[PDB]
Design a protein around this ligand. Structure first.
Ligand SMILES: [K+]
Length: 887
């Protein structure tokens, strides 16, 4: 379509011409039209073929989780509350104008819960969501028991040197390795039926109740509410020495409320989960947002009969290729304890599920394939014992960061056994670092349950709110989180985690989508789905988003780590991803081969490129296992891109003519108030980041049918921005020009930005030109002005006699472009704007001509031009020339 769709608010979409004007009566309440009540809002939209697919979700939605029986997750059907999220297909039904009409409507039902699954769900606990205002110190949690305390007890590390071997701990040098972190202080953990609080502790090493939910409601919630009360008033607001109050930051990331109380976790998880949409020839796929963990995603068969309910597939049911199989195992071993003969000791690992949650970046389609990316949300076992048990109320988690004397090559670094089955890092003193070595047997690791616990014990599953597994407030955590563990000897090289800060991506075939649908619909037991064209990557937050890290040496940890993060987040430890988008490269490839395609996604401090081999629709690889997998490239932001508030992402578009992605950030999406309940004042304006491909791409000639270097991208805060206007929309008309529609009060105003060697700058004279449209749909045309149509001066009629063209015929002149171009002189308003003349015979002696002129979008327009079938009626002139012969 020749037009741009703009979400004007939560319900309405309006169609815009390339002249930044609305098509008259295009404005449409998609919610009303989808026959959904006014609690519903548009979450996401996409065009596929010609139709508009819209994902809708409800403010009134209520979900409950009941551990007994077995249809355990369901909607709360008393009051208003049976309000599932829908996807809708609309088609334009006029040839003139835009008249959307509904075609199909698909309901997104709650997930089936298998018996096995319900035994994990029973005791599943979830961290409160990370928020703009969450602090490094808010995240910090107190260190759990050491390796020897769990295994031996009261009985120091002199017993260690010889009792190692009888707990399967042979040659392990780290009796002082953390086994995880206390769940009795810190960010709240809650089960599916409880509700998270509006308060976050400032120092979670001291100030919150963690999972101690009873604790919270009879002591500590009272200290919070008194320290950090909501804005109502007459004003009131107190002191915030202990807790932030983030209710409004919670409202703004999609947490739902009954008055001042968040709804239950499972409800929050369902609302979040229905956030992004992608479409292929057979499927609709819906996945969650990048603010909360999603535990499931929907595959909807477009063939689905009207009033079906469509079912989500659990990710715990979705095995991915993590790159090597050992990468999968790191993750699964740390999910929870095994053998677990025990009694009620059910967690994700103990029941043979895989990683259960992701922080999804987003979701797209290229050619019947689906692309996703995301962060592994942290998940680990915790001891829920209730009697001693040394680990009681502790989470079980440890660094899995590669040892120093590992062979240096992606595969070697990745498969190295360090931390595979249990703890091993912490501090080590011979030129101090956090990582070591790896006589009569190899070094060994094992899970922090002691063998006399074996079957007394109760290890249940939790999920974090970020990509960290391990919150323990020791120094290894900071270096894990910030990509600071480095080796020696070679040209250095950096040591990966396999559990913290793991990015995941892939491309999913339609047969893959088909097993997932089948997994979701499975009778009785859990059936499973393998997605084989995926990878994983250790992707830490840049360390330059902190200050004052002590190395060469009392060590810096999460509770002392100082954030200078500029990207809108208080914290400098947790990664975040947004706005995954694919596109087809316009730059053609050798004629044997199929069109290249990529995706990009934003993370903290850089853009990630995803590279594909088309024509077999796989991740890109090279053969040498040593070089890192070539389907991922990371290019760090400069200062100006890092300055953008990532929490303000509004949308991302791709343009095929230009080969460029445009990320739109709208500051109006900032919460109303701070975590100190102060009003937020920099909520005005917007920012655009433009991402392009870099590098040598696949298949340009015989040299590049294979590659040992991954293609990359580059993001550039492009010069299009504002701290003053309220954005309606950005129309990327061409590489050389973008149009911005904004208000300074109640206006809509059009501004044109022009690209000057890679930097966009506003052009005031073009803006005034484009914006003077006199209420029509396009810029006016004035004879004496170099306006948006340039300027056209016609030759006088006496040119015919001078040039001896009177001897020619009308039809002869009319069939000679070259001659017609000599009847006018054009002056362009921008550098390569083109114009020609269209002729029309008027009589035997005479013709008329009328210019056809190129606009900022690169298209030609003339008298007969339409958009969405509606004539523009731009007033191009026409001029008669006469005195031609009839030979
Ligand atoms: K003009």
């Amino acid at each position: 379509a020749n037009t741009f769709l703009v979400k004007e608010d939560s319900k309405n979409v309006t169609a815009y011409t390339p002249f930044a004007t609305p098509i008259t009566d295009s404005k449409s309440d998609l919610v009303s039209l989808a026959q959904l009540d006014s609690s519903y809002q548009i979450a996401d939209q996409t065009i596929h073929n010609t139709n508009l697919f819209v994902l809708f979700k409800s403010r009134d939605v209520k979900v409950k989780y009941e551990s007994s029986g077995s249809n355990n997750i369901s909607f709360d059907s008393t009051s208003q509350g049976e309000k599932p999220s829908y996807v809708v297909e609309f088609t334009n039904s006029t040839n003139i104008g835009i008249k959307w009409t509904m075609v199909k409507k698909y309901q997104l039902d709650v997930p089936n819960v298998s018996s096995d699954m319900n035994q994990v769900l029973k005791n599943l606990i979830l961290e409160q969501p990370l928020t703009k205002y969450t602090l490094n110190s808010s995240l910090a949690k107190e260190k759990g028991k050491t390796q020897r305390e769990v295994h031996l007890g009261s009985g120091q590390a002199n017993q260690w040197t010889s009792q190692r071997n009888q707990h399967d701990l042979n040659n392990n040098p780290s009796p002082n390795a953390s086994t995880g972190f206390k769940l009795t202080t810190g960010n709240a953990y809650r089960k599916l039926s409880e509700s998270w609080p509006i308060y976050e502790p400032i120092d979670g090493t001291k100030q919150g109740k963690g999972k101690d939910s009873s604790g919270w409601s009879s002591t500590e919630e009272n200290e919070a509410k008194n320290d950090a009360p909501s804005v109502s008033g007459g004003s009131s607001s107190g002191t915030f020495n202990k807790y932030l109050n983030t209710k409004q930051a919670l409202e703004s990331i999609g947490i739902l409320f009954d008055d001042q109380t968040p709804r239950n976790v499972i409800t929050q998880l369902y609302y979040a989960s229905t956030s992004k949409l992608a479409v292929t020839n057979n499927h609709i796929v819906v996945m969650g947002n990048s603010f909360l963990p999603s535990m499931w995603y929907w595959v909807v068969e477009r063939s689905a009969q009207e009033n079906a309910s469509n079912k989500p597939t659990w990710f715990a049911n979705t095995n991915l290729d993590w790159g090597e199989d050992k990468q999968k195992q790191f993750v699964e071993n740390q999910l929870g304890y095994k053998e677990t003969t025990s009694t009620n000791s059910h967690n994700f690992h103990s029941k043979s599920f895989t990683q259960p949650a992701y922080l999804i970046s987003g979701i797209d389609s290229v050619n019947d394939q689906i692309i996703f990316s995301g962060f592994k949300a942290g998940s680990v076992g915790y001891d829920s014992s209730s009697s001693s048990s040394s680990t009681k109320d502790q989470a079980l988690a440890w660094s899995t960061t590669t040892s120093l004397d590992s062979k240096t090559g992606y595969k070697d670094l990745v498969t190295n056994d360090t931390g595979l089955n249990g703890p091993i890092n912490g501090s080590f003193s011979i030129q101090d670092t956090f990582s070591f070595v790896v006589t009569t047997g190899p070094i060994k690791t094992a899970y922090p349950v002691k063998k006399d616990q074996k079957s007394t014990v109760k290890i249940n599953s939790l999920i974090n709110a970020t990509p960290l597994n391990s919150y323990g407030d020791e120094g290894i955590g900071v270096f894990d989180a910030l990509g600071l563990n480095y080796n020696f000897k070679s040209n250095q090289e950096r040591l990966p985690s396999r559990t913290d800060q793991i990015f995941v991506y892939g491309i999913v075939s339609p047969n893959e989508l088909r097993s997932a649908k089948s997994s979701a619909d499975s009778t009785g037991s859990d059936t499973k789905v393998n997605w084989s064209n995926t990878q994983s990557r250790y992707l830490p937050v840049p360390y330059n988003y902190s200050e004052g890290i002590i190395d060469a040496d009392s060590v810096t940890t999460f509770s002392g780590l100082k954030s200078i993060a500029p990207d809108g987040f208080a914290n400098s430890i947790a990664n975040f991803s947004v706005g995954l988008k694919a596109g087809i490269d316009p730059n053609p490839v050798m004629s044997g081969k199929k069109a290249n395609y990529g995706a990009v996604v934003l993370t903290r401090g850089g853009v990630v490129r995803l590279n594909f081999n088309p024509g077999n629709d796989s991740l890109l690889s090279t053969t040498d296992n040593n070089i890192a997998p070539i389907s991922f490239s990371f290019t760090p932001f400069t200062a100006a891109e890092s300055a953008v508030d990532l929490t303000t992402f509004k949308e991302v578009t791709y343009n095929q003519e230009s080969g460029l992605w445009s990320y739109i950030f709208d500051s109006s999406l900032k919460p109303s108030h701070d975590g100190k309940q102060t009003p937020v004042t920099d909520n005005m304006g917007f920012s655009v980041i433009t991402v392009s491909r870099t590098g040598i791409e696949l298949n340009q000639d015989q040299a590049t049918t294979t590659l040992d270097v991954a293609p990359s991208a580059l993001a550039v805060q492009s010069g299009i921005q504002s701290t003053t206007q309220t954005l309606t929309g950005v129309l990327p008309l061409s590489e050389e020009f973008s149009a911005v529609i904004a208000k300074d009060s109640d206006q809509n105003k059009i501004d044109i930005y022009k690209n000057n060697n890679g930097l966009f700058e506003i052009d005031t004279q073009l803006s005034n030109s484009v914006a003077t449209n006199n209420g029509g749909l396009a810029p006016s045309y004035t004879e004496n002005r170099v306006d948006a149509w340039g300027k056209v001066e016609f030759a006088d009629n006496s040119v015919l006699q001078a040039r001896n063209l009177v001897d020619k015929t009308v039809d002869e002149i009319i069939n000679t472009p070259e001659i017609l171009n000599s009847f006018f002189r054009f002056t362009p308003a921008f550098e390569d704007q083109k114009a020609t003349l269209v002729a029309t015979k008027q009589s035997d002696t005479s013709l008329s001509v009328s210019p056809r002129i190129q606009f900022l979008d690169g298209n030609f327009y003339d008298l007969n031009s339409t958009i969405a079938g509606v004539p523009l009626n731009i007033g191009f002139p026409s001029r008669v020339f006469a005195g031609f012969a009839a030979l």
